Amino acid sequence: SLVPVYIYSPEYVSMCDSLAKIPKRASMVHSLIEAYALHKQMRIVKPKVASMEEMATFHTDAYLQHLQKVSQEGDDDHPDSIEYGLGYDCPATEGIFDYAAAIGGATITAAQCLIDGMCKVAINWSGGWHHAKKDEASGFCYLNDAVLGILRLRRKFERILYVDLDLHHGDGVEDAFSFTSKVMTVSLHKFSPGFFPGTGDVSDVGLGKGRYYSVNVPIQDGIQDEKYYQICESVLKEVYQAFNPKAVVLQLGADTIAGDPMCSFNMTPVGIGKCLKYILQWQLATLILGGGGFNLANTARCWTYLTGVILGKTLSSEIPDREFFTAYGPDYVLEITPSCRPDRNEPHRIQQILNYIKGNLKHVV
Amino acid sequence: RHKK
Numbered sequence: 092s093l094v095p096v097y098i099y100s101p102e103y104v105s106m107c108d109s110l111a112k113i114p115k116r117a118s119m120v121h122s123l124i125e126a127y128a129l130h131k132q133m134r135i136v137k138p139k140v141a142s143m144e145e146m147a148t149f150h151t152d153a154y155l156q157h158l159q160k161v162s163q164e165g166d167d168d169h170p171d172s173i174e175y176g177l178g179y180d181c182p183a184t185e186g187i188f189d190y191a192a193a194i195g196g197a198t199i200t201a202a203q204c205l206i207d208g209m210c211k212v213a214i215n216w217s218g219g220w221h222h223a224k225k226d227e228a229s230g231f232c233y234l235n236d237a238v239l240g241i242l243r244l245r246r247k248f249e250r251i252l253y254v255d256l257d258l259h260h261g262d263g264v265e266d267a268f269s270f271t272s273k274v275m276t277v278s279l280h281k282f283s284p285g286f287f288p289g290t291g292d293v294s295d296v297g298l299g300k301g302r303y304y305s306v307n308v309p310i311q312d313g314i315q316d317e318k319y320y321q322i323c324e325s326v327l328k329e330v331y332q333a334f335n336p337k338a339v340v341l342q343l344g345a346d347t348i349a350g351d352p353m354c355s356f357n358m359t360p361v362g363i364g365k366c367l368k369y370i371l372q373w374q375l376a377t378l379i380l381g382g383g384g385f386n387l388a389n390t391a392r393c394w395t396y397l398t399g400v401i402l403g404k405t406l407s408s409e410i411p412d413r414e415f416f417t418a419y420g421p422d423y424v425l426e427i428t429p430s431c432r433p434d435r436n437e438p439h440r441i442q443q444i445l446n447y448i449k450g451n452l453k454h455v456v
Numbered sequence: 457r458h459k460k
């Protein structure tokens with residue numbers, strides 16, 4: 092009940108490596124963690140696959156059935172596929188339904204471990220696919236495992252706090268709980284017209300009854316560890332005192348990290364780690380999730396470092412991975428250095444957003 | 457609908 096649970100199996104990793112947008116990323120992440128032998132300090136739990144009924148706790152049957160329809164062959168000619176979000180971002184590959192079921196089940200499993208109290212922290216670095224809607228694939232996400240996990244945690248915990256530190260706005264998770272006060276979503280993300288998914292302004296606070304139970308922090312390009320943590324710590328301090336969560340689901344997409352081809356934020360795993368630490372000291376049942384991350388080595392770097400933070404261990408600077416060693420070139424170190432790119436976040440705009448948010452969180456009681 |  093003090094040792095973190097690590098959702099892992101060779102079958103699971105093999106399945107997660109098959110996502111066309113992040114090939115072999117899951118293997119790289121586990122391999123680096125395995126090389127630091129951090130999995131020895133964690134209880135490794137094999138993930139179950141989500142049943143149709145379990146997946147249908149959020150996704151509609153029409154969508155799920157269309158998923159397994161095009162999945163049993165790899166059909167890309169179905170006219171209704173585009174309306175179900177399938178296409179460029181989410182290709183109608185073969186076995187994509189088993190893929191979704193596997194990832195969805197892994198997060199449910201992690202949530203189940205929290206419920207049973209075999210751990211306070213449960214890790215699934217291959218999850219956090221927060222863009223998926225109830226009947227629509229979106230942004231590399233075919234199925235919203237984050238939502239399925241929050242729903243499962245609600246069997247035991249009354250109020251769930253969702254924190255989304257991915258580069259992109261966690262719209263799918265926000266929309267799923269937009270109407271309720273039992274789950275509060277907090278998303279820090281890049282907000283600019285044309286940039287996916289296009290939602291998550293500071294004025295988006297939820298609907299009707301989930302009003303002020305959705306928090307969005309629009310950030311611009313070039314932000315670094317220091318300022319990011321100050322914005323994050325500020326929001327989470329107000330959020331915690333106001334919402335008083337019984338359990339936390341934390342998405343940690345590494346597409347904020349410097350060196351990512353999307354080239355927006357200028358973060359290092361250290362900055363994300365401080366956010367992690369602030370959440371961990373709440374001593375609540377925490378479900379750790381991955382997400383974005385399109386520099387594979389850096390994503391492996393980040394999540395391996397974060398796993399070290401959770402274990403309270405300091406990792407050696409030298410990369411000990413042998414299978415994917417060359418990928419960490421040319422310097423082969425765990426640490427990441429930010430780019431020489433300007434921070435387009437003026438301190439007064441940030442101050443405005445923090446005031447707006449604080450004004451919203453006063454209604455939460 | 458956007459592209460990611």
Ligand SMILES: *Nc1ccc2c(C)cc(=O)oc2c1
Binds near residue numbers: 180459
């Ligand atoms: N949304 C998005 C953006 C960029 C992409 C590249 C460069 C490749 C790809 O396969 O899918 C992408 C999707």
Ligand SMILES: [K+]
Binds near residue numbers: 256257260278279
């Ligand atoms: K986010």
Ligand SMILES: [K+]
Binds near residue numbers: 301
């Ligand atoms: K909400």
Ligand SMILES: [Zn+2]
Binds near residue numbers: 258344382383
């Ligand atoms: Zn993302």
